[PDB]
Amino acid sequence: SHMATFVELSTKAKMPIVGLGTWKSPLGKVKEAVKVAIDAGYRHIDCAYVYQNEHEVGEAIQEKIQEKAVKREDLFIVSKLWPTFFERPLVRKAFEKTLKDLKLSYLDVYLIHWPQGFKSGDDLFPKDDKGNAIGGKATFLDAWEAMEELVDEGLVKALGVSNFSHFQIEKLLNKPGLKYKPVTNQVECHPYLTQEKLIQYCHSKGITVTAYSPLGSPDRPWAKPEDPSLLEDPKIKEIAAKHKKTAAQVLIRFHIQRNVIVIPKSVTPARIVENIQVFDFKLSDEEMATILSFNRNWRACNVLQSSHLEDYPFDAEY
Template identity: 50%
Template sequence: MNLTAQSHSIPLSDGNRIPLLGLGTYGDPRTTPKDTALECVKLAIDVGYRHFDGALVYFNEHEVGQAIREKIADGTVKREDIFYCGKLWNTFHPPELVRPALERTLKALKLDYVDLYIVELPMAFKPGNEFYPKDQHGKYIYHHTDLCATWEALEHCKDAGLVKSLGVSNFNRRQLELLLNKPGLKHKPVSNQVECHPYFTQPKLLEYCRQHDIVIVGYCPIGSSRDASWVNVKCPPLLEDELLVSIGKKYNKSSAQVALRFNVQRGVVVIPKSFSPERITHNFQIFDFSLTEEEMKAIESLNKNIRFVELLMWSDHPEYPFHDEY
């Protein structure tokens, strides 16, 4: 696979393509200054990024869309050069809410279509104006999940031209099989966005997805923030790993660049999130070196099967995906 900064996209099973390196755009809406995403996405496009991963619940799609539109207007890119992934949130699983949710994303972006739209989590929450609905005791209010009915509504969105490709996120094997075996399946999921990095290499899920022509998109590809409210901080910091650091020294690269290159080289899409101009630039510099077969195997053997993102606050949901082995 000859990957370059200009050309590093891989085919999806529906005939579309996805760049192997993208920019994650999540930032805590309570602490991220206004226009941060706007400036960072514009910078990223100038650096060479063409893939952006966003979501309605990030509360910044209007900024991401503005950045993309400004860069189209100034002639840096065309719309078809950009790959945008949006996400269907848990409160919009009932079929009649799927298209309105996607239309909210399109309205925020001020774009006619998104390239990929994915079911963010296989767990439905009570529909309504609250994204995180809770009862008077502070307990999350769940909703019955019919993933097949939700998927059918997504298929209609694709047929209507609002989205080019459909995928899922945080689905385990059983949940993927539910969709793949759905009677009358029209558009199969082309991707599954899951946590994936050298400490959590996802060998079984990766193999299963390869067999079914589903691309793995890896979030937290260089570990994650140490935010104890949603991250398992007992995990050792990935970027301090001795092997990653020593391989990095050989190529004059950082452990982060080695971790990103590792996944990209095995066909896993990576979407490192950063709002630091230095790191955005740094994370893109992974196309001027490649790891040997021995190095790839050595990094694979770092797998500890530990998740940074466990989402334990929802572990009592009937469709919580992480109870299964994969």
Template identity: 50%
Template sequence: MELTAESHSIPLSDGNSIPLIGLGTYADPHETPKGTAYESVKIAIETGYRHIDGALIYYNEHEVGQAIRDKIADGTVKREDIFYCGKLWNTFHPPELVRPTLEKTLTTLQLDYVDLYIIELPMAFKPGDEFYPNDESGKWLYHETDLCATWEALEACKDAGLVKSLGVSNFNKRQLELILNKPGLKHKPVSNQVECHPYFTQPKLLEYCRQNGIVIVGYSPLGTSRDPSWVNLKCPPMLEDDLLVSIAKKYNKTTAQVCLRFNVQRGVVVIPKSFSPARIKENFEIFDFSLSDADMKAVEGLNKNILLKFSFWGHTSGSFEKTAQ
């Protein structure tokens, strides 16, 4: 299949399709000026992006939705041209909370449906008004959750037409099997959003997902940021890697473009986050070249099995460290 800026979607197992590159919209609400996400999504759509990755927990779905609606209103796109992914946060795993949470996202976006809705993490926090609940000593307040019951509530949302496709995020093989082997399964997860880049290539998980018709969506496809509050600083800056720099020079591209192209050639969807107009446009310019088989193999060889580590993963870091298993 030839990938172009105008045509770069791949099929999902439920008959829908997903664009191979999307715009990530995560932002720290305390440090990001109002209107930033709005302007970035508008620029992305004007550039050619048709896939927007968002979440309730990003606190900016109102801006993202406004940008999508404005670009529909001015004739740039139709609603069916846009692929929006929303996420079910950890505090909303109880089945009775699933539909109201999705409906809150739809109300905020002012859209009738989302194209993909995913369980953001396989673990759950204590339900309530706090997105990051802690006890008096600062320890995370977790909640026993039945992922199969959560999934059944998501299936009901799909049947009701609130979402086109269902997926998961940060699930390892064992957690995927819980869903895939669920008695009475109506709708399989079509995607699994996980960290994926040349320093963390996910070969085992990628193969397992391929065997089960699940598309990998790679977040942090350009490596990690350098924020010590949530990033594993043992991971060296990937975009400065000597091999990636040399390959980029060979193709007259940037190291970021090489990293993105590497994943899309493997059938991995990439969702680089940027609020810089220049970077948004640069990240999209990956359809006018392709990496040779030798270069693909060389980049695969960079795998270090190094991943981000969120502080609230600490108690179950073993299960998450095995994401690649």
């Protein structure tokens, strides 16, 4: 039986430092994966409207509660608002659909998924006549305002952001009449993209960081063979064997020792268990410095090249 360390948020709520990622987890597999994760000791699940698997995640959560395998109060469920729903009435609708699918009465954290607003309508990925993303009417500051109302009504415990640069976080914090501060910024992070400056900034403002794609998202559709590959990095593997651990476990531990929340995804039962077995070893200061030195400023997940729209996050240095 396993328990992930708590990272305290600015609201005093406790966020498990390891959670389960659910992106690309297919229907027919994610239910069992969540069941396995909960049995193994995971209490933090990372979800999203756009992953379109939340109802299956909801079933597994409900069945485990009925089973008395776990209590709601000890689960930590995160989902995300997709940018085609930034317009106020759509925030509540998308949120409601997420909450129904998940079979919950509240979410622990609700994130802005991506800072650029997209055209509303039936398409989740609106493009023009070329494959160019079409922007929306509402900005992420508009969406936030509607999201704050969710917190006022007890439906969500805390808010956060995903894929924000420090400029965009600045914009959020400086917003007039801000009711709630983000408790986390969820961003890609791993040894090829160390986010030293972004992490430094977020921490200085009492904002935690959640590391996504910590294994380098090998199952991402657009992966190319020549693309750098963290799980096969001989230097990572060599630090692993010294601790009698797998590479995946080092990659996960790396975030833990920087106090960064981390959410590796798997639908494979043995890997789900292996991924939370990371509290029984410690990387030395030297080993941490070596891994930090692998930074390549490489983004595994950067399929959105919508730099024509305002608030493209990745043009900024951090």
